[PDB]
Amino acid sequence: AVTLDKDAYYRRVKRLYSNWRKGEDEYANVDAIVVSVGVDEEIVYAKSTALQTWLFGYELTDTIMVFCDDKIIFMASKKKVEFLKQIANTKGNENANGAPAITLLIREKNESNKSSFDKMIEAIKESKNGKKIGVFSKDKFPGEFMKSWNDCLNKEGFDKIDISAVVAYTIAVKEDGELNLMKKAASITSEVFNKFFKERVMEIVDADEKVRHSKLAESVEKAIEEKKYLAGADPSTVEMCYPPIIQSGGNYNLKFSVVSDKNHMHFGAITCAMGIRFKSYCSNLVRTLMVDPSQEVQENYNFLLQLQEELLKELRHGVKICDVYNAVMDVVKKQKPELLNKITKNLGFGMGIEFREGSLVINSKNQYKLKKGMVFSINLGFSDLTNKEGKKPEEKTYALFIGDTVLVDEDGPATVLTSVKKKVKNVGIFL
């Protein structure tokens, strides 16, 4: 039988209730929080399943959770219900005080679930003002169970309030156990880059091979099925956060939402983005490899490194994210104003069970304050740079992209969890 970490459940559900009751921003008018997971074949990033992973240690498909002021209802298959009895039966657990008692309902396979749906709907109507439900608006899972539930729920005319941003902030600070998972993810990412990827690229360059970016990305995906790069980790606990992104030869997009294209790799500036997800917890790395970079290319690259460390020095508990952003852009404006229009609009983002927290992005508008124990992907780049010495079109335009997994510390500059050496000595390839 799979053990549920009960103490972690009670700590975290208490954090959720504390913030909900505090009633700031999107929490203010919410009468009940309603979270439902359908079929998930692709294991997509979603607040609904991230919340499950946070509370229970595991995603639970075809499962509904209703958080009310004085009760909590979980509805799932008999086997998942049996699993949840570990926290539903409290057995005098001291930690159980900060949240309501749990009622478990069984999802029937061969029978109508109307009776259970009605119980949850009545619980919502009875919770606080019984009018508005907190939801994750982006999440729509397929399958018959979600169809049936949504049909039932939609008849009731509850107002839906998106709570994605406030929940992101609620779960952002990592417990030590979670940080250990993210540290392991970061170390696996670093080992795959150091031992496999960088070597592979140097082989390709030394042999003057023509390799499509897409094919190189596939090779990296295959590499993490090999135990030699996992340092003891069960291979089934390791996944890519996203398909590895390799770009070169004047075609760059510096973001994590695009895949590697089919062009042959140019021995240029080669941007390489990859991250490992270990036991559902994400990490991220970006390195640019440079073949015979000129003095001017090196100058821009070293300035990029300078900006990153300036960012880490500013990313400290209590500081507003936008103020970190402005501090870094101030350095660009002062020292290299010509790069103001070349630099990435975002400098990084909060990272966790979900890879990229859209409300935690480091940009000019973000008002959220940093807290000790939050983890970020800190990413900075320059795009659309011109190489003067370039002749062919693939040589003329280059980009520079750097990123690391970092931890907001107790005091002082943020701590870097990834370990891949980034000096020109390390990422330069000289023919």
Numbering used by the authors: 2 to 432
What are the paper's exact sentences on this?
Here, the crystal structure of the N-terminal domain (NTD) of human Spt16 is reported at a resolution of 1.84 Å. Our human Spt16 NTD construct consists of residues 1–510. While the construct contains residues 1–510, electron density for residues 433–510 was not visible. The structure of human Spt16 NTD reveals two lobes: an N-lobe comprising residues 1–175 and a C-lobe comprising residues 176–432. The structure adopts an aminopeptidase-like fold similar to those of the Saccharomyces cerevisiae and Schizosaccharomyces pombe Spt16 NTDs. Despite the presence of a linker between the two lobes, the orientation of the two lobes appears to be rigid across the three Spt16 NTD structures. Isothermal titration calorimetry analyses show that human Spt16 NTD binds histones H3/H4 with low-micromolar affinity, suggesting that Spt16 NTD may contribute to histone binding in the FACT complex. An ITC experiment with human Spt16 NTD against H2A/H2B showed very little change in enthalpy when Spt16 NTD was added to H2A/H2B, suggesting that Spt16 NTD does not bind H2A/H2B or binds with a very weak affinity. Surface-residue conservation and electrostatic analysis reveal a conserved acidic patch that may be involved in histone binding.
